[PDB]
């Protein structure tokens, strides 16, 4: 059966850093992206839809724009990264890839975000 996997299921980061984070996927031979769909999520916030080669930005939630990105040239690799950067404290939580490719599997990801008051303060809502 398909199952998606994670290496490395927990990140610290420090705020306003970049982060690459990782599911990997089985690709048989060569990589057919007509067959793939690669979906992150995080926390009820959609992040990346990435539908036969197409990231379909539809209803990405407006704090990724121009922000989060799949790392294409990682999925011929059965790696699915996905990239954020400038990372702020709604960024830390948990995480799910969920990818289709002739089956469909998750996996959760844990992430930290480290940051001092004054920058903790910075994106504070009431």
């Given at each position: 059966?398909?199952?998606?996997?994670?290496?490395?299921?927990?990140?610290?980061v420090?705020?306003?850093?970049?982060?690459?984070?990782?599911?990997?996927?089985?690709?048989?031979?060569?990589?057919?992206?007509?067959?793939?769909?690669?979906?992150?999520?995080?926390?009820?916030?959609?992040?990346?839809?990435?539908?036969?080669?197409?990231?379909?930005?539809?209803?990405?939630?407006?704090?990724?724009?121009?922000?989060?990105?799949?790392?294409?040239?990682?999925?011929?690799?059965?790696?699915?990264?996905?990239?954020?950067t400038?990372?702020?404290?709604?960024?830390?939580?948990?995480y799910?890839?969920?990818?289709?490719?002739?089956?469909?599997?998750?996996?959760?990801?844990?992430?930290?975000?480290?940051?001092?008051?004054?920058?903790?303060?910075?994106?504070?809502?009431?």
């Open positions: 059966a398909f199952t998606v996997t994670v290496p490395k299921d927990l990140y610290v420090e705020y306003g850093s970049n982060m690459t984070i990782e599911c990997k996927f089985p690709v048989e031979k060569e990589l057919d992206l007509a067959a793939l769909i690669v979906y992150w999520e995080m926390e009820d916030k959609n992040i990346i839809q990435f539908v036969h080669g197409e990231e379909d930005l539809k209803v990405q939630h407006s704090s990724y724009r121009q922000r989060a990105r799949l790392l294409k040239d990682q999925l011929s690799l059965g790696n699915a990264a996905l990239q954020i400038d990372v702020k404290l709604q960024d830390a939580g948990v799910r890839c969920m990818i289709s490719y002739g089956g469909a599997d998750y996996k959760r990801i844990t992430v930290k975000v480290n940051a001092p008051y004054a920058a903790a303060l910075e994106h504070h809502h009431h």
